[model samples]
Target: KGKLMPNSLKDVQKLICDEGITDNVITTLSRLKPFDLAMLKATSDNKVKTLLDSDELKPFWVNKFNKLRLEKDHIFQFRNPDPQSRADFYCGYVLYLAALKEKQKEISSYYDYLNLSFTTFNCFYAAQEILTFLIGACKNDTKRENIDLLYNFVTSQSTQIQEHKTPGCLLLANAYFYLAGFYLSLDLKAESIECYKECWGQLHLAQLLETDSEREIHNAYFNKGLATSNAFGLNSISEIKARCLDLASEALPYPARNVMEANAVKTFENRFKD
Candidate 1:
């Protein structure tokens, strides 16, 4: 039996009353329907408001709903003009997802954990993009603040970042490249060198796995080569400069080879005497 109603509002109200679903679980389910987009948004707004309004419901689901809302909203506002707000939101977003993995007792399968890891990787990647924008804007101390946030986040997850072996290796490779560049910009030559070395180590693992795409592996190799060469140049260590030159000659593509070799030569000549 189907009762045609004057509007979706009446239908939702009747369904909620009949189902005795006072928790706005009804609206959560309703939003899943193939209804008009406007109707879905309206229903979602109502659901959130109702959840917030009910004292009992708020205590039960407020944090969960709020986290979910932030996750959803951040995707849309990732490029928000306010760097402080953007960084805060994404930092919480990444940590919340990381906590989910931390708290999981038993996964149904390895792929289940891999799926979660992919989600975590995506959030970090998005944060990197936003951080890059903020760093460029150079808005007083805020830029440095967000850079510190990025540094902390990447280093904290550095050890446990890889979970899937192959793709995980590639993911960490990209992450370390980002971190290495950040360190290099700050003239932290030793730190940058360490990050570039770790990136190459991960790329080595990726190559051993033999599942990484050629383009990805090539890009990682080239980036690590360039960073290694640049780090030595910044440090002015002759032995390391020679090693960096050799690595670049072996790994970097044709175009980067000349540039890296020239940089290495200049550093060696300037810092060492025969």
Candidate 2:
């Protein structure tokens, strides 16, 4: 909230949307940008280790269900779920059964995702989180095994999409963005470019009711990144720079000028700029 603002469209789009969407669905969602966000949020696996690996936990009896958050009220030893803890397994099993009964309900309000709305467990996001976390729920020891994590995130959300989605060209463009990002993350260029194009297929399907800045910004960003995917190619910074001068703004119905001054600065900031 000082001079450190997120760059529009590119950085914000990268940081916010993909993560937020996954947050709605599922932490291993976090594993998608394990390095970057681990830098930002920095919720340490050491914290998990402190509980699972150390003796940092104590015990307390509260009058509520699900009260002892490991971060806040560290009051008990967490079960390792390995070996044979008959009593622990029995309790966890009963909890799972109760959670299964919780899922049949539908969410109708915005606050439906909040803690107070919980039943048995925070089934809404927690269930999806469990799905996501179980995928690549690794600590640093398993950091090298990320493709499975990437693959899990890429596949997990796709299956959860609703029926009103797709066909009549029923496309899933936004999904390809995550696919593109994931592929690009792991050093696959051709595959990454192909996925970005799939997002374009969905982009073109968008009705041009008005000159949507978000849409155009994404178009600019895909081209900006995809060119590199082609080895050596054209830069889409010109679109970012186009409004820098204003002829395109005069020509197009309306322009998606994030800010002319900001675009002008980045024109050379990225390496010419890249």
Candidate 3:
């Protein structure tokens, strides 16, 4: 429940809306057949715990009808189904739930499998969080099964990006970027650079097309500069120090919003300054 209340509920509401259910649907659902009524009645007493654990109810209410939400009053808009798009949407969420479970240390929970299934078809945010989980989890012990799972998850996520939408591409790019940084923190240079390439590709696309973009181009330029500098630092072919300094120069004209992203960028910029 940590860091996952409001946002998670919002996400849930969005998912419900995306599935074409309205208040009428809820009303109708309440008046379902005898069997359905019995099923819901059985589930009436338990709240979140019941929903999360119920294989039968979860699919019917949450999965099939897409009424299951982690949060209240939040749902996603229904986009025309592109098979891959639906897969991405579902998988991305599963991955998110897995990470949350991992964080909460509920490793044996069925939710863990649910999380893994989301990434089986494709990986995006799921891939990133899964990798993040593995990197942290593996620190205590190196398990072959865990390693295999991580590798496979990453491969699937990568393949999906090469075969999906621009937003998916953008998400993959950022995921890789985060994964690369995570690896770098662990001193895994080779893996880190690989993710950096992916991030750069997506960030590049995100910066393109001035219209219909929810992306922040201003930050994109700053990130481009930072990424270029990081690439140089890793390769040692260019004066990464100087490139970073120059990038900072470019970034300085933009005002600081003092938000999470702005603060993060400033932190990175500060690293090159001294």
Candidate 4:
């Protein structure tokens, strides 16, 4: 009443204990000078709990997560293996929040959606520990919704995704593989073959540019071979199988043929046997 007050971490803690943390305080803390590492670390666990309990704070957390993502020091703190890992939780949290916002029609821009996907993929790669966490968080009905969102985005933005500066050939290839599987599940052989062809093409391009691993290329060839084996015509199936064997042979280790190559050769023999 008599004197003006000065703020401190202790004051913030008291505030949290009293009225609980709010979006305003979270934003203020996030925007503090020098990034407020100490305060952030001190309150991270409770902050995450508070954010999880409030939908209004999710967007603030997303923005704060992105800002921290750019800082190596802060980023590592989030990737910590402990249950208290703020970064790991936030990865899934933001993705779930983005999905909710999209469902609510609050997210309007394709760029915004792309940014969320890129962030999730990048964070998944950066912190492997968060991969299972993110998937686990999206379990049950939310899982199907997330999968639909991903498939739709990838298919609709295939061109932009492939041409983006970040170069997502591997991601595109996987997306095509999933589409191929989906078509196959529906007994749409011709459509499945088309998707498989696109998947193989993307994988080949990735290999030619040395942007993807030989293991991935080999897997793509293997899957393509299986898809081709199911084609309508004998000649078409055999021709694709021959090419598949050749690609698999290139990727297989020399002097000792692997189970994959052996199976491919056996399949070819069975296909051609009279």
Candidate of highest TM-score = 3
Off by over 4 Å in 1: 1-145, 159-161, 210-274
Model 4 earns a TM-score of 0.31
Candidate with top lDDT is 1
What TM-score would you give candidate 1 relative to the actual structure? 0.32
Clashes found in each candidate (C-alpha, N, C closer than 3 A): 0, 8, 10, 0
Evaluate all candidate structures by whole-model CA lDDT and list the values in order. 0.41, 0.31, 0.41, 0.41
TM-score of structure candidate 3: 0.38
Q: Write the per-residue lDDT of candidate 3 for residues 167-220, one digit (tens) a residue.
A: 443445444544655565666666655555445444433333223222322222
lDDT for each residue of candidate 2 in 198-242, tens digit (9 for 90 to 100): 444333332121122233222222223323311123233333223
As a whole number from 0 to 100, the lDDT of residue 250 in candidate 4 is 33
Better lDDT candidate (1, 2): 1
lDDT tens per residue, model 4, 143-210:
44554454565566554434321123444555555555555555666655555555555444333333
Q: What TM-score against the true fold does each predicted structure earn?
A: 0.32, 0.23, 0.38, 0.31
Report residue 156 deviation for candidate 2 (angstroms).
6.6
Evaluated against the true structure, the overall lDDT of model 2 is: 0.31
Clashing pairs in 4: none
